[PDB]
Amino acid sequence: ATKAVCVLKGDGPVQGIINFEQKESNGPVKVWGSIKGLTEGLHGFHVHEFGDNTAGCTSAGPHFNPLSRKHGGPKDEERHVGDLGNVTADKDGVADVSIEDSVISLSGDHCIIGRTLVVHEKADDLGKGGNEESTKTGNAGSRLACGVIGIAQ
Amino acid sequence: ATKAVCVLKGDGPVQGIINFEQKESNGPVKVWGSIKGLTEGLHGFHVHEFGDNTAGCTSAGPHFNPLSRKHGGPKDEERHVGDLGNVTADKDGVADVSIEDSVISLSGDHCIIGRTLVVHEKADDLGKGGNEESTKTGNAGSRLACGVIGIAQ
Ligand SMILES: [Cu+2]
Ligand SMILES: [Zn+2]
Ligand SMILES: [Zn+2]
């Protein structure tokens, strides 16, 4: 199988460990982990294009969009490859992530290993906000934490 | 992939920025950058296997060796893929990086993207130290700083 781990770190109390798993070259990737230091509610969850940490989470660039599409939901027809939707944090700010996506990959041209996974400040409207920013970032807000996706054991 | 990036950080004072450029899929990778906070002398510079920073640079794993060989220099036949050799820091502790390695690669079977780049405490004997650790890590010492090699623009 193929595994991957991401160490989410930020300037504030936002930090978490996100794990990935793909048992086949075309199989769905299982995203699970726990993030702390988040406001109670929904938070953006997207994989950005570049695995750059030279200027914090800003150097990661926009969302992973190899097909040159518009931002949307994970189960929507129009979406970026790195669009994973929202992650919900409880009252204690703990976000026990559990996402099963069939669009992202751990090997190939649309692979996410070597890029940046980012948890955002606000919620993702999944490209339904009605503005231009909904079809680019989903109005998810600023980047609280980020980390370079890497190969794990 | 033709460009990569790796931000070096640790629990101590060592920190730096390393860039990778591989214009040809079968050409050498230009590794250049600058690291600071080191001791004046030679320090280990190897690419480890796992891009795992959950437990620090310890979870990074051993040196990247997909051919199952022994530790050596960068211009040696018997060497791990990540065995880039040593780096020299000046009297102020700044080590200007400039390595051209054809064994590593930004794509393919020898892909270092998604793995980690680890700097070390002491010098690397290139497998000629005289002990058992010489053929594994080269007596490079503790991992001072590490980071996941990410895709760059
Ligand atoms: Cu090493
Ligand atoms: Zn998007
Ligand atoms: Zn080695």
Numbering used by the authors:
A (entry chain B), B (entry chain A): 1 to 153
Passage from the reporting paper:
Eukaryotic SOD1 is a 32-kDa homodimeric metalloenzyme containing Cu and Zn ions at the active site in the active state. The protomer of SOD1 forms an eight-stranded Greek-key β-barrel fold with four conserved cysteine residues and three long loops (loops IV, VI, and VII). The Cu and Zn ions are bound at the active site by loop IV, whose conformation is stabilized by the highly conserved intramolecular disulfide bond between Cys57 in loop IV and Cys146 in 8th β-strand (β8). Eukaryotic Cu, Zn-superoxide dismutase (SOD1) is primarily responsible for cytotoxic filament formation in amyotrophic lateral sclerosis (ALS) neurons.
The wild-type SOD1 structure was determined at 2.7 Å resolution, which contained twelve molecules and two partial models in the asymmetric unit. Interestingly, the partial and indeterminate models occupied the large space between the honeycomb arrangement with the highly diffused 2Fo-Fc electron density maps, reflecting the structural flexibility of SOD1. The arginine residue is immobilized by the interaction with loop IV in the wild-type SOD1 structure. Thus, our findings showed that both the wild-type SOD1 protein is dimeric regardless of disulfide bond between Cys57 and Cys146, unlike the monomeric C57D/C146D mutant SOD1 protein.
